């Protein structure tokens, strides 16, 4: 304790520059009455060695008031593969937020950020492919290729194989990407093999009447990796030609990191779509327990997700940057990735075509995947035209064209104006004037 | 929603009866000023369909904060390979995305019921304490208490000093395990440490004349590296390979880590360590699930053992985890002969507290992973672990500890090492023991 796991004269800058320590930031409160630096010596020790050769997890800073504890964890602490040489997220959480999360002399404790040094960062998988792979299928520039418009298949469950394939076919006449909702698997009333053979078919017909390549994200989530692998393999070989048009969804939260690592290493040539199925209590309203969505997501790039459900509503734009850039500033630490492929944000929502440009402007790009509600798709003409206006709104954004001038020569974007006339004045006044009328 | 997803005229006996509906029970409170029933009907819609097959709320109590929902077994995914159930599904459908909601504040799963048809498609344990009992050369029916410890400290001991600390302990105790993180650190690699721990096993087993057990951590991210440690660790114990428990940190690596171990090494004790959990499991969390549901879920998955607690969490948990017919906070489960999951009690249980604990619990059929039951004895830790055995054998036999404590020194001395518990649990001890 105290003199053992507390070294408050440590410059965080030295530590970063040393490159031998992982640093963590938490917002923990010592139970009723307990010393502030004493508890943090204790939370450090339980995290560290129990009962000093740089095996000790030092407390380089505390901010009694703000309830801010920063701890430096030597990189040698962290387990590594016997096989690979490779680091693991399982170790990382075990040390960092393992049953230090269960103590009895700490009200609550939540990790807010973490720094990973080069020696350590580099032993991790990182993403194998991203949006970039999606773009190249879609015949877009692999660098800054833009917006990929998607839905989820509402209802979430209860559609037989054909109804389901037909919902897919239908949607792909406007849109680019469909993704199996969260529990869609191998229910008795709509078997995986029957559905995925049918859905395979719907791609062919959609592609052929459209002339555009279409995208599908199939969950292969399962308890057993060989089952996860079983699916990966039956899906990719049933899409055959269109094997590279399939993304593999794995509910990484609710099935653990071994599930995420199974697809990542098994199928490294396909987009690994990480569902954030239901963080809740951990990544929350400020569940004073576990970690935040910033950290959950930052952790996934290191793990190897290609894309991950990220945000709708300091922000999920901060998360976005940390995930996609080579240098990103988090709430407490600035991180470099020394050329580690980015993980594509998958925004959920449904802006609409007139609000779409707004989104892209604050973010600074449109290199996301949008899994829009059947709401973002609402239009007076429909979801085929709803989805087309979304596409149309990216091109005018991209190209620099005033939307309204572009709308004039673009039907569905034009008909959108009128589809949400309430938002048009607000955002863009005189639209009718320019013609809508 | 509402009307579609609710049907409060459904009797719970009836849904049990058909045994074609998974029933879950929650403590949820809708947000700001949303109807109780409505919110629940929406939550039923969020888990299930949304647009039986449809998930139907069959019992509400707004005053108590209770939503009880009936999910048809049809909704629950299964393997294309096996034809078998999966926990990930049980979790995505009844816990998930559904977790997150607006109009929904908190909802915690407090208990669940798995029909007959559906409970039978899960893996369930493969081995349990009777495997440990059979190696320690005990009865596989009421074989009793297994004395263990976490080797301390957590990390830092090099291959050799680790091996030698292990050997020390194994001269007085039975089970030794690896800590939340010990593995393949640079300063104490796994191959070097497992190789040398294998020897310390053979040595102490030779000196002592007793079979001893080790619990080796094989947790990892990649299932093929979990298997690799698994295989390395048993290849190196050679002959003593039925003595190795395989410890998987199932909360932190997930369902897939648990099931890689359970299915690839079915003949070894799958020790399920729940480091973490405290977040979602918190008794101060109003989200996720309770410890009862955590561990009820584990039997199904197939852990052979699970860290259970010390202190209707555990008393109820213990019976749920080991009986073939246990009663939970809301539902009565029947497990149709699915093997048990041994509690693994941890904490500071000296030899004085042992007796009562076995009297409340009713058996001594658990593994104890001692620290200050052991390392706390005035005469050292070997002496400490010998004091626990002795307290156990006392209880077992019907000998009354002060009695058993006269013929046995380690036990005479427990009382001397924790006088607070002595004073308090055995009055007259000073006197009776004499000295």
Q: Check A255 against B260: CB less than 8 A apart.
A: no
Taking the CA of residue A260 and the nearest CA in chain B, the distance in Å comes to 8
Of the candidate CATH numbers 3.90.1150.10, 3.40.50.2000, 3.20.20.110, 3.40.50.620, the domain formed by A125-419 belongs to 3.20.20.110
Residue of B361, B244, B388, B369 lying closest to B306 (CA atoms): B369
Residue A260: its chain B contacts at CB < 8 A? 221
- Element containing residue A421 per DSSP (H, E): helix A421-427
Nearest CA in chain B to A259: B256
Q: Give dist(CA B325, CA B333) in Å, integer.
A: 6
Residue B156: its chain A contacts at CB < 8 A? 49, 53, 55
Taking the CA of residue B399 and the nearest CA in chain A, the distance in Å comes to 36
Residue B35 φ/ψ, nearest 5 degrees: -55, 145
Taking the CA of residue B94 and the nearest CA in chain A, the distance in Å comes to 10
Q: Check A90 against B252: CB less than 8 A apart.
A: yes
The minimal CB distance from B75 to the residues A82, A157, A284 is found for: A157
How many other CB atoms are there within 10 angstroms of residue A429's CB atom? 11
Question: Which of B1-39 are b and which e, b meaning 16 or more Cβ less than 10 Å from the residue's Cβ?
Answer: beeebbeeebebeebbeeeebbbbbbebebeeebebbeb
Q: Check B301 against A222: CB less than 8 A apart.
A: no
Q: Give dist(CA A292, CA A279) in Å, integer.
A: 9
Ranges in chain A annotated CATH 3.20.20.110: 125-419
Ranges in chain B annotated CATH 3.20.20.110: 123-417
Ranges in chain A annotated CATH 3.30.70.150: 3-124
B431 classed as catalytic: no
Which experimental method was this entry solved with? X-ray
Fold of B123-417: TIM Barrel (3.20.20)
Taking the CA of residue A334 and the nearest CA in chain B, the distance in Å comes to 26
Q: Give dist(CA A283, CA B193) in Å, integer.
A: 37
Residue of B245, B212, B233, B243 lying closest to B382 (CA atoms): B212
Task: Please report, in angstroms and rounded to a whole number, the separation of the first and last CA atoms in chain B.
Answer: 75
Q: Report whether B177 belongs to an annotated binding site.
A: yes
Ranges in chain B annotated CATH 3.30.70.150: 3-122
Q: Could you list the active site residues of A?
A: 154, 275
Q: Report whether B339 belongs to an annotated binding site.
A: no
Q: Report whether B154 belongs to an annotated binding site.
A: yes
Q: Report whether B179 belongs to an annotated binding site.
A: yes
- Token couple for B203: 């040595």
Q: How many residues does chain A have?
A: 437
Q: Which of B97, B183, B277, B369 to mutate to test the interface with A (most CBs of A within 10 A)?
A: B97
Structural domain B3-122, CATH architecture: 2-Layer Sandwich (3.30)
Q: Check A225 against B223: CB less than 8 A apart.
A: yes
Q: Give dist(CA B197, CA A79) in Å, integer.
A: 18
Q: Check A90 against B257: CB less than 8 A apart.
A: yes
Q: Does residue A185 sit in helix, strand or coil?
A: coil
CA contacts within 13 A on the Cβ side of B73: 19
Q: What is the resolution of this structure in A?
A: 2.9
* Catalytically annotated residue among B68, B108, B243, B273: B273
Fold of A3-124: Alpha-Beta Plaits (3.30.70)
Q: Give dist(CA A110, CA A100) in Å, integer.
A: 10
Q: Which of A223, A233, A283 to mutate to test the interface with B (most CBs of B within 10 A)?
A: A223
């Amino acid at each position: 304790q105290s003199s053992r796991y507390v070294n408050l004269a440590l410059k965080e800058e030295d530590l970063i520059a040393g490159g031998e320590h992982v640093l963590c930031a938490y917002i923990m409160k010592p139970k009723a009455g307990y010393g502030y630096v004493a508890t943090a010596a204790h939370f450090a020790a339980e995290s560290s060695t129990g009962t000093t050769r740089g095996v000790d997890a030092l407390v380089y800073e505390v901010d009694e008031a703000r309830e801010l504890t920063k701890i430096a964890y030597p990189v040698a602490l962290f387990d590594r593969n016997i096989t690979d040489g490779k680091a693991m997220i399982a170790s990382f959480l075990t040390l960092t937020m393992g049953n230090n999360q269960g103590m009895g002399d700490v009200e609550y404790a939540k990790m807010h950020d973490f720094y990973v040094p080069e020696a350590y960062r580099a032993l991790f998988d990182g993403p194998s492919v991203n949006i970039s792979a999606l773009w190249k299928v879609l015949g877009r520039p692999e660098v800054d290729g833009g917006l990929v418009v998607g839905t989820i298949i509402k209802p979430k469950l209860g559609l037989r194989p054909k109804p389901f394939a037909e919902a897919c076919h239908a949607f792909w006449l406007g849109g680019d990407f469909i993704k199996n909702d969260e529990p869609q698997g191998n229910q008795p009333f709509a078997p995986l093999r029957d559905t995925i053979a049918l859905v395979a078919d719907a791609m062919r017909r959609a592609q052929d009447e459209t002339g555009e390549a279409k995208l599908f994200s199939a969950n292969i989530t399962a308890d057993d990796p060989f089952e996860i692998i079983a699916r990966g393999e039956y899906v990719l070989e049933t899409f055959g030609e269109n094997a590279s048009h399939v993304a593999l969804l794995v509910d990484g939260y609710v099935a653990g990191a071994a599930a995420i690592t199974t697809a990542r290493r098994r199928f490294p040539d396909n987009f690994l779509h990480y569902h954030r199925a239901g963080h809740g209590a951990v990544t929350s309203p400020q569940s004073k327990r576990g970690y935040t969505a910033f950290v959950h997501c930052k952790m996934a790039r290191l793990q190897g997700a290609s894309g991950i459900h990220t945000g709708t509503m300091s922000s999920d734009r901060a998360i976005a940057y940390m995930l996609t850039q080579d240098e990103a500033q988090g709430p407490f630490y600035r991180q470099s990735w020394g050329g580690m492929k980015a993980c594509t944000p998958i925004i959920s929502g449904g802006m609409n075509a007139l609000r779409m440009p707004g989104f892209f402007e604050n973010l600074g790009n449109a290199n996301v995947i949008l899994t829009a509600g059947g709401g973002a798709f609402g239009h007076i003409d429909g979801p085929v035209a709803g989805a087309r206006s979304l596409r149309q709104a990216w091109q005018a954004w991209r190209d620099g064209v005033p939307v309204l001038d572009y709308a004039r020569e673009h039907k569905e974007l034009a008909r959108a104006f009128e589809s949400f006339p309430g938002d048009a004045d607000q955002i863009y006044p005189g639209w009718r004037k320019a013609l809508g009328v």
